[PDB]
Amino acid sequence: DDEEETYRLWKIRKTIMQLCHDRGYLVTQDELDQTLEEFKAQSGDKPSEGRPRRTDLTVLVAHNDDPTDQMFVFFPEEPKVGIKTIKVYCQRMQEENITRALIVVQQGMTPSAKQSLVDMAPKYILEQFLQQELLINITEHELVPEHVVMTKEEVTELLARYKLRENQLPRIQAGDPVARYFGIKRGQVVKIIRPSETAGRYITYRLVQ
């Protein structure tokens, strides 16, 4: 004990950071290849480490298009997150003056906060991931073909090519694990590059509903 939990912490940090990079926010390469021993060097052993704070991260910004757009990552400690804790998180958020933030739950989170997690504000939205899921980054799994998001012009050209109306494309569910990974909203489009049985590749497009 105190070694498996630290391994979990390092792994979840690695995967979440990979997701931040993939979404295109600011990130430093030297931290991408951070080792577990490096994590021990930069953070003490489990008994000496405080879960609700130690891992909190907000360095990532949307430097891809706007370095001024900061983003916040939180890691509660209680097995089920409570209303008061998210109220503290939301007041801290308002103090920081940001739009969105990510939350990592250990085991669950209370039903009243389940309901609140859809209607905090039109201008603010929150995204919750399970520790269990984050332990592995699905993007690397063998059975998940590469997904890519594209700009509105690309979809314009595509729909012009086949002479289609947007609502004719194949669908992809919003709650899909990959859709959650990419944090994409309804009405976007996704390209897929299925690895053929041979060197070839097949391209197909799916819409998020």
Question: Which residues of the shown chain bind another protein in the complex (CB under 8 A)?
Answer: 1, 3-4, 7
Opening angle at CA 159, ends 153 and 165, nearest 5:
125
What is the nearest approach in angstroms of another protein to the Cβ of residue 107? 15
Q: Choose between 13 and 206: whose C-beta lies nearer to another protein.
A: 13
What is the nearest approach in angstroms of another protein to the Cβ of residue 7? 7
Q: Choose between 9 and 101: whose C-beta lies nearer to another protein.
A: 9
Q: Choose between 3 and 56: whose C-beta lies nearer to another protein.
A: 3
Q: Single out the residue of 46, 45, 40 nearest to residue 77, CA to CA.
A: 46
What is the nearest approach in angstroms of another protein to the Cβ of residue 132? 11
Q: Choose between 7 and 39: whose C-beta lies nearer to another protein.
A: 7
d(CA 138, CA 141): 5
Q: Single out the residue of 66, 75, 54 nearest to residue 99, CA to CA.
A: 66
**Residue 51: CB partners within 8 Å, gap ≥ 6?**
75, 76, 77
Q: Choose between 4 and 33: whose C-beta lies nearer to another protein.
A: 4
What is the nearest approach in angstroms of another protein to the Cβ of residue 79? 16
For residue 203, the cross-strand partners are 193
What is the nearest approach in angstroms of another protein to the Cβ of residue 130? 16
Instruction: Answer yes or no: are the C-beta atoms of 76 and 104 closer than 8 Å.
Output: yes
Q: Choose between 4 and 37: whose C-beta lies nearer to another protein.
A: 4
What is the nearest approach in angstroms of another protein to the Cβ of residue 51? 19
Instruction: Answer yes or no: are the C-beta atoms of 207 and 172 closer than 8 Å.
Output: yes
